[PDB]
Amino acid sequence: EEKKVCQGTSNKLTQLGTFEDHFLSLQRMFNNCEVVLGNLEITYVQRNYDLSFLKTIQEVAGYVLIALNTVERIPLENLQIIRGNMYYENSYALAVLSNYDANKTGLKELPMRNLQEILHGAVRFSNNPALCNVESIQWRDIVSSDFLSNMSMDFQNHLGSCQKCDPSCPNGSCWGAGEENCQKLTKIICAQQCSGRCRGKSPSDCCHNQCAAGCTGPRESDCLVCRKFRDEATCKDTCPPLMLYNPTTYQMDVNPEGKYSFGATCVKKCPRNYVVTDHGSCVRACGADSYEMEEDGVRKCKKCEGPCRKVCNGIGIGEFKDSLSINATNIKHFKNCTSISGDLHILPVAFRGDSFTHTPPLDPQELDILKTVKEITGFLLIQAWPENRTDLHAFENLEIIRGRTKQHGQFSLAVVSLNITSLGLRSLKEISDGDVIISGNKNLCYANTINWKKLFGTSGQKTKIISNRGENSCKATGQVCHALCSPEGCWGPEPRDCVSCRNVSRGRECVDKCNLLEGEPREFVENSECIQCHPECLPQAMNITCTGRGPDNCIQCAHYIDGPHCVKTCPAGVMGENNTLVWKYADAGHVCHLCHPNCTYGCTGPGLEGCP
Amino acid sequence: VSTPIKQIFPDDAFAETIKANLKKKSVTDAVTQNELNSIDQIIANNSDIKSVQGIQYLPNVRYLALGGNKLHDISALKELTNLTYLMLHYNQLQILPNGVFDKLTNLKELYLSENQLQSLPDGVFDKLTNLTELDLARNQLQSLPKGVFDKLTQLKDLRLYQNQLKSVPDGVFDRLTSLQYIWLHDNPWDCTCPGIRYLSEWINKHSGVVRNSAGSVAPDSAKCSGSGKPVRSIICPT
Ligand SMILES: *[C@@H]1O[C@H](CO)[C@@H](O[C@@H]2O[C@H](CO)[C@@H](O)[C@H](O)[C@H]2NC(C)=O)[C@H](O)[C@H]1NC(C)=O
Numbered sequence: 001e002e003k004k005v006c007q008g009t010s011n012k013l014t015q016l017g018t019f020e021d022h023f024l025s026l027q028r029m030f031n032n033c034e035v036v037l038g039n040l041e042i043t044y045v046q047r048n049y050d051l052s053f054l055k056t057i058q059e060v061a062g063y064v065l066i067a068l069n070t071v072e073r074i075p076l077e078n079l080q081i082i083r084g085n086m087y088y089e090n091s092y093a094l095a096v097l098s099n100y101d102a103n104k105t106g107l108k109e110l111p112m113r114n115l116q117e118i119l120h121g122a123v124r125f126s127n128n129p130a131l132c133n134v135e136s137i138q139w140r141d142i143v144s145s146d147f148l149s150n151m152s153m154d155f156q157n158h159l160g161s162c163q164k165c166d167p168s169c170p171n172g173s174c175w176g177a178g179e180e181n182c183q184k185l186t187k188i189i190c191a192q193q194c195s196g197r198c199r200g201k202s203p204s205d206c207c208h209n210q211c212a213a214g215c216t217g218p219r220e221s222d223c224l225v226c227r228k229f230r231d232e233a234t235c236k237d238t239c240p241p242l243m244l245y246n247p248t249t250y251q252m253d254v255n256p257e258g259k260y261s262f263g264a265t266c267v268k269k270c271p272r273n274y275v276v277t278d279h280g281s282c283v284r285a286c287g288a289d290s291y292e293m294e295e296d297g298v299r300k301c302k303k304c305e306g307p308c309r310k311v312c313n314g315i316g317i318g319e320f321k322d323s324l325s326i327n328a329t330n331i332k333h334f335k336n337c338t339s340i341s342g343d344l345h346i347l348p349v350a351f352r353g354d355s356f357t358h359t360p361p362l363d364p365q366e367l368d369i370l371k372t373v374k375e376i377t378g379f380l381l382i383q384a385w386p387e388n389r390t391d392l393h394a395f396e397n398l399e400i401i402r403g404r405t406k407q408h409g410q411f412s413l414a415v416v417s418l419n420i421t422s423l424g425l426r427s428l429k430e431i432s433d434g435d436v437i438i439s440g441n442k443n444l445c446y447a448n449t450i451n452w453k454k455l456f457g458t459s460g461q462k463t464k465i466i467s468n469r470g471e472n473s474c475k476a477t478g479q480v481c482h483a484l485c486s487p488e489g490c491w492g493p494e495p496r497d498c499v500s501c502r503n504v505s506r507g508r509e510c511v512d513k514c515n516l517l518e519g520e521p522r523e524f525v526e527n528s529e530c531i532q533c534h535p536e537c538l539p540q541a542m543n544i545t546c547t548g549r550g551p552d553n554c555i556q557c558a559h560y561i562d563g564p565h566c567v568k569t570c571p572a573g574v575m576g577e578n579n580t581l582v583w584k585y586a587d588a589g590h591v592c593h594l595c596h597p598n599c600t601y602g603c604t605g606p607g608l609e610g611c612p
Numbered sequence: 613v614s615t616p617i618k619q620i621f622p623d624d625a626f627a628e629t630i631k632a633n634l635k636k637k638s639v640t641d642a643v644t645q646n647e648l649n650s651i652d653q654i655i656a657n658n659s660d661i662k663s664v665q666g667i668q669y670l671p672n673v674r675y676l677a678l679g680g681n682k683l684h685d686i687s688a689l690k691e692l693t694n695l696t697y698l699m700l701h702y703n704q705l706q707i708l709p710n711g712v713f714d715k716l717t718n719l720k721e722l723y724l725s726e727n728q729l730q731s732l733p734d735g736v737f738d739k740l741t742n743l744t745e746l747d748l749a750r751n752q753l754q755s756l757p758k759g760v761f762d763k764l765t766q767l768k769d770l771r772l773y774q775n776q777l778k779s780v781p782d783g784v785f786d787r788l789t790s791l792q793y794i795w796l797h798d799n800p801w802d803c804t805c806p807g808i809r810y811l812s813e814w815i816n817k818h819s820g821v822v823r824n825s826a827g828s829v830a831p832d833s834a835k836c837s838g839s840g841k842p843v844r845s846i847i848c849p850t
């Protein structure tokens with residue numbers, strides 16, 4: 001019942017070197033194969049090659065592509081189903097194309113005796129002139145309704161004679177010579193009583209709604225192959241869900257009878273290569289959107305929260321060997337970088353261009369590339385910067401400068417000789433080692449406000465703040481820290497430039513107070529951070545609304561209450577233990593209570609009379 | 613025994629500062645000498661403090677940041693002998709009393725960088741043999757006492773830029789054997805030989821040390837008033 005699984009392929013019309021290399025590559029993918037999880041692509045196979053190994057295949061999840069083969073026969077004698085997860089030209093589940101050459105020779109035989117259903121997709125046939133017999137095939141039985149509009153069936157055989165469908169076959173429909181090849185029919189040959197397929201003509205010969213190709217009986221475990229999912233010899237809409245709702249505990253529990261979806265199979269543990277997905281599937285690897293975290297023992301896939309960490313060299317290393325500065329050439333190599341193993345130099349050449357080096361001028365806008373950077377391992381040196389830019393905008397997301405290497409062996413941060421008015425390193429929270437120099441910035445204000453020691457991780461560290469803008473000038477021009485900033489300084493005049501907020505902070509923004517009596521949404525406070533109170537909690541006019549993030553932590557519930565949790569609608573139709581749905585009702589006081597077991601389809605009150 | 617905070621520290625801002633330091637609720641909370649002995653750093657930059665009175669009773673303070681306040685008197689700092697860092701940048705010091713630093717022997721960093729000083733007491737920095745950074749920039753300094761820097765042999769960074777000096781005493785820098793950075797620019801140096809001989813000689817002898825606005829080696833940075841020409845370019849001859 002559990003079959004032998006093949007990854008599939010998605011090369012399409014490409015050829016891996018020699019015809020023999022291609023072939024031997026193909027034979028290595030589908031040897032001893034029954035189920036193919038990807039797409040099946042038979043390609044560039046020549047005459048007198050033994051494709052005996054393809055007989056073993058029974059089902060394919062993706063699409064089937066049979067293209068550019070001059071071999072006489074392709075024995076897919078047992079393929080039963082194409083799910084059509086993936087389409088070839090975004091219409092086609094099955095595609096057979098140009099299996100022919102200028103040698104006047106081509107593919108004659110394609111006996112899919114057992115191809116019985118295609119869930120999604122259409123078919124295409126073009127330029128298989130050697131091929132016969134398939135023209136007989138009636139595709140109403142195989143294909144879904146919705147798709148028969150996008151079928152491109154051009155059959156022409158001129159290359160040779162073929163045999164006629166042994167009369168035993170119905171309406172002359174066969175996949176080839178012999179009664180063994182007669183088309184089997186299980187959809188268009190059944191009484192209207194049957195929604196699904198059938199194993200006979202009568203209204204008792206109906207199959208289950210979950211059968212795909214055909215049946216040995218009417219039961220859910222009698223299908224040849226499943227429509228949706230198979231759970232150990234039965235077919236199901238969905239696999240048993242991993243999470244069940246505990247009505248005594250009121251929180252979700254993990255059910256031990258829960259399963260993950262490997263392809264179209266319900267499985268307790270995913271395979272070894274594999275990882276789980278938020279929908280519940282077991283999958284080859286997490287999306288480039290994402291990374292792997294093993295949580296509660298299962299290696300799930302989580303999504304980045306920011307560009308995924310990427311580690312790039314700094315100037316003078318590897319890619320940037322013998323470079324002097326981030327210049328117009330090399331600034332693009334920093335795209336999607338999070339962390340620099342090395343130092344950064346932004347020097348005046350970069351803007352001028354350097355001809356001896358063949359380097360052009362740098363367009364300021366492109367500095368935005370560095371917005372993604374959050375860590376530097378060495379030092380940061382900026383001797384040049386756009387003249388009409390107030391602050392260091394490129395580094396507003398820089399969180400840490402480790403300074404394992406240092407300019408002149410001393411400085412891990414050097415902002416020198418610039419026209420900036422603020423540093424704007426809002427995100428910078430640590431300079432692990434090495435000194436700091438902010439020197440010669442005539443317009444720069446705010447620098448001396450910072451309690452630099454807060455950033456230092458090594459005790460002998462020092463800061464040089466020299467010949468910047470006079471504090472007296474900077475003060476008189478109102479370019480001082482915001483009234484909401486702590487005595488610990490700022491990176492600019494805004495309340496989001498603060499190093500610590502004076503009272504509290506909302507986002508990255510700072511005070512004045514968190515929303516407690518008045519609120520756009522109401523909030524609560526922990527670690528001096530304004531945090532929203534849960535939505536299902538009703539804002540109090542005389543008191544506080546929340547004491548915590550959750551629906552446990554509210555004073556009055558807006559709508560209904562379920563145990564401890566204040567909820568918008570009371571649970572009605574949620575799965576639980578012994579594979580049964582859970583139905584609650586609200587009483588007059590809006591507290592929600594469990595219904596009578598017998599009230600299977602729901603309720604309005606206790607016990608039936610609740611369940612009429 | 614315990615005593616309320618604003619009783620010890622009369623200045624509202626400083627009381628609030630100490631309260632913040634000790635994680636207390638109110639300046640009316642009272643504190644024990646053991647709680648006072650807990651303070652080893654105060655970061656009180658830009659807090660409107662007009663007086664640090666009461667700071668005498670914090671014997672263990674090592675790191676003291678008071679820059680950008682309204683202080684004119686720092687006599688309360690005299691006995692804080694564990695002090696290693698003292699930031700008093702951009703306050704309102706018009707004058708330093710004598711022997712104000714005589715106790716502060718462990719000091720390694722001293723910033724007085726933007727007060728309104730006009731002269732320095734005679735031998736004001738002499739007991740500070742461990743000092744490594746001295747910032748006296750952007751004051752209104754008229755003249756330096758003779759041998760004012762004579763004891764500062766550990767000093768690596770001296771800042772005198774943007775003052776009103778026209779001459780330095782002969783040999784004033786001679787004992788700064790560890791000096792790596794000096795800032796001399798934006799002074800109206802009186803490049804009149806034979807007065808300016810020592811400063812030309814010294815700048816020339818140690819051109820690597822002399823720095824500009826950008827921290828770069830720039831021995832031309834010191835400029836003659838009227839002329840506007842480099843001091844070291846002046847040969848005052850016998
Ligand atoms: C600008 O960046 C480019 C790319 O890093 C530098 O190009 C390198 O230049 C050195 C010195 O001439 C050569 O030995 C390398 O082979 C070049 N590498 C590449 C990848 O082209 C360039 O030197 C930098 N210019 C400046 C002024 O910083």
Ligand SMILES: *[C@@H]1O[C@H](CO)[C@@H](O)[C@H](O)[C@H]1NC(C)=O
Pocket residue numbers: 502503512513
């Ligand atoms: C914000 O903090 C300052 C300093 O503690 C204080 O003057 C004021 O009480 C606070 N404002 C509030 C809590 O609204």
Ligand SMILES: *[C@H]1O[C@H](CO)[C@@H](O)[C@H](O)[C@H]1NC(C)=O
Pocket residue numbers: 387417418419
């Ligand atoms: C800033 O840019 C240059 C280089 O520092 C300097 O010459 C100039 O004074 C400033 N110019 C402008 C337009 O801000």
